[PDB]
Structures are given as structure tokens and as C-alpha cells.
Design a protein around this ligand. Structure first.
Ligand SMILES: *[C@H]1O[C@H](CO)[C@@H](O)[C@H](O)[C@@H]1O
Lengths: 323, 4
């Protein structure tokens, strides 16, 4: 059976987490995203000026082209990328997927051209949302799952410290107590779960659904929830230069918790201080609006407080406080 | 930050 551990590292302020991946012999630093199902990388098919500052995949060296297949994806923050497809060997934490579809970028939007922290994304959402045309392909996880000791992956994302991606096994030393599981609705291709209620400092409210997403930096909630939270933070104000609600870095922030199948997942107020707003003397809040989309995005701010198991059997999500 |  196979299993493996890949180490992740946050970039400045934990904006994103990158992990090395070897594709056809070349190691690239990718952002693992449980919110999408495409494995795409910077390649030699991009204009030379865009390859700058990145490790790039050269498809002609080792990939097998899928004649006539294309891919095109657009993300929640407005970024997008597109290209062609090859199959190659992909190794993550010593687990190798042979014949994994690799989406070589031909076009990337400005957000990606400006980000030199990563060399592409490795999607970990369900394969049902992979964008390859005319026939969708399976994610790295779906490609290898039958070979793992257990068909699951688990993650521990940390605040300014290296974390891990466990593939095919659960490391019990990464959390306190026992895991609590909840069912996942994968109808929209995400690792979606329900919360029965929430507590924002001194205020509690009714439940809602959300997706566990390693690819989103913050905890994005309904505006009602955001208002309620910030109404308890002295001097909090929206700052479009910063991207949302900001406050004095010294502010004591209330905690935020959700009740999941009887388990209370708590994000301490210290983890809600994201960092310097990068606009004056304030800090940006880890909780911001979801723009009215109807569901919440449990991004890195939330994840930094738990060890999370993504189990294909159910499917289901397991949670426990990080040790 | 980003929103994948
Ligand atoms: C993950 O699990 C596999 C299967 O038990 C081991 O062979 C590997 O060393 C790691 O513990």
C-alpha cells in the first residue's frame, strides 16, 4: 500500500501554502487547492517573459500530449488560466501517479503573472469539476486513491510554520483527542459540509453550509455574520485599499466557532488577526464577506486551527483541534 | 489573499 507526507510552507502572512511536486523529473512549488480539480503548471508554452521567476514544466521532454484536449479555468478571485494537456508522472510526498493529466499553461491572468510564490495549482476537489475538454480527467488524488492504504488525505496548515499534507493515512499525533466526522455533499464538486450553529464572540446564530478550501486565504462568511462579528471589534472599519474590515493590530478579537455534528470547531481570535493590512497601521481581519454567494468558504484562517481529514469513503470530513 |  502507499502513503506519504508532503510538507507545505506558508508564504508571507500565510497568504498561500506551497508544496513541492515532481513532474516528469522537475520539481515545481504548487498551491494545493481543495476548491478546484485541475493540476496546472507554468510551462515552456508561456511567453518567456512570463516564465520568469518560476520553475516550469517542459512538456516535450517527458509528457505525452492529449491531441485536441484543452483546459480553461476561472477562480473565485477573478484569476484564470488556460492551456493544453499532457500525461506525465507526478510525485507528491513519495506517492507517484503514473499517467496523471498535467495541464500546461498557455495563458495566465495578471494575478498569476504577479505571483512568484507558486508554479501552478494541484486541485484536490472532486474530479467531477475538472475542466479538461472534451473529456475531464482525474485529480492527483483520484488517480492514486486505489493504491493508498486508505482513500483519504489529511491536512495540517500552520501559522508561519511548515505543515503537512498526509496522503493515505492519518497522523494521530497532529491533533488532540479523537476526530469527529460529518457527511460531505459533493454534488457541486466541493468538500461541502453543514454547520448546525455558530458563535461569533458574544453572539450565536443559525447554521449554514460551507466548503473546506485550502486554496482560499480567509474565512468568507455571509455579510450578516461578518457584521455581527465586527460590531464587537472596537474601531473596525472597511478599507477597500486593504480588502475588507481592518482594525488596530492590538485589538483583542473575539473567537469564532461552528458546531459540526456535535463538535465545536473554534478559531481563536489570535488567528483572526491575518496581519498587516498593508495600508497604514491596521491589520486585516481573517473573516470577510463571501459576496452573497449563498455558502461559506472555510479557508486557511479556519484550517490553521484544525487537523482535517478528507475521506473519499462517505465521503466525509473529519475534524479535531491541531496539536 | 486569494480565492481558489
Ligand atoms: C504510510 O503508510 C504506508 C502503508 O502502511 C507505509 O508503508 C508508509 O511508510 C507510511 O507509513
Amino acid at each position: 500500500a502507499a502513503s506519504g507526507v508532503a510538507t507545505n510552507t506558508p508564504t508571507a502572512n500565510d497568504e498561500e501554502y506551497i508544496t513541492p511536486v515532481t513532474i516528469g523529473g522537475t520539481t515545481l512549488n504548487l498551491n494545493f487547492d481543495t476548491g478546484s480539480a485541475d493540476l496546472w503548471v507554468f510551462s515552456t508554452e508561456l511567453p518567456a517573459s512570463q516564465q520568469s521567476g518560476h520553475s516550469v514544466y517542459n512538456p516535450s521532454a517527458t509528457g505525452k500530449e492529449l491531441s485536441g484536449y484543452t483546459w480553461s479555468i476561472s477562480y473565485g478571485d477573478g484569476s484564470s488560466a488556460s492551456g493544453n494537456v499532457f500525461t506525465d508522472s507526478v510525485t507528491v510526498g513519495g506517492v507517484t501517479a503514473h499517467g496523471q493529466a498535467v495541464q500546461a499553461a498557455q495563458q495566465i491572468s495578471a494575478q498569476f503573472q504577479q505571483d512568484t510564490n507558486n508554479d501552478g495549482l494541484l486541485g484536490l476537489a472532486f474530479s467531477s469539476i475538472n475542466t479538461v475538454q472534451p473529456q475531464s480527467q482525474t485529480t492527483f488524488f483520484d488517480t492514486v486513491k486505489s493504491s493508498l492504504a486508505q482513500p483519504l488525505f489529511a491536512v495540517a496548515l500552520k501559522h508561519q510554520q511548515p505543515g503537512v499534507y498526509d496522503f493515505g493515512f492519518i497522523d494521530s499525533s497532529k491533533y488532540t483527542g479523537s476526530l469527529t466526522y460529518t457527511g460531505v455533499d459533493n454534488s457541486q464538486g466541493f468538500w461541502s459540509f453543514n454547520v448546525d450553529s455558530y458563535t461569533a464572540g458574544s453572539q450565536s446564530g443559525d447554521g449554514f453550509s460551507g466548503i473546506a478550501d485550502t486554496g482560499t486565504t480567509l474565512l468568507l462568511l455571509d455579510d450578516s455574520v461578518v457584521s455581527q462579528y465586527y460590531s464587537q471589534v472596537s474601531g473596525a472599519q472597511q478599507d477597500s485599499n486593504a480588502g475588507g474590515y481592518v482594525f488596530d493590530c492590538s485589538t483583542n478579537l473575539p473567537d469564532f466557532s461552528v458546531s459540526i455534528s456535535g463538535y465545536t470547531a473554534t478559531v481563536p481570535g489570535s488567528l483572526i488577526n491575518y496581519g498587516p493590512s498593508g495600508d497604514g497601521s491596521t491589520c486585516l481581519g481573517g473573516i470577510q464577506s463571501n459576496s452573497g454567494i449563498g455558502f461559506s468558504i472555510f479557508g486557511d484562517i479556519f484550517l490553521k486551527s484544525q487537523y482535517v481529514v478528507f475521506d473519499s469513503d462517505g465521503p466525509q470530513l473529519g475534524f479535531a483541534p491541531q496539536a | 489573499x486569494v480565492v481558489x
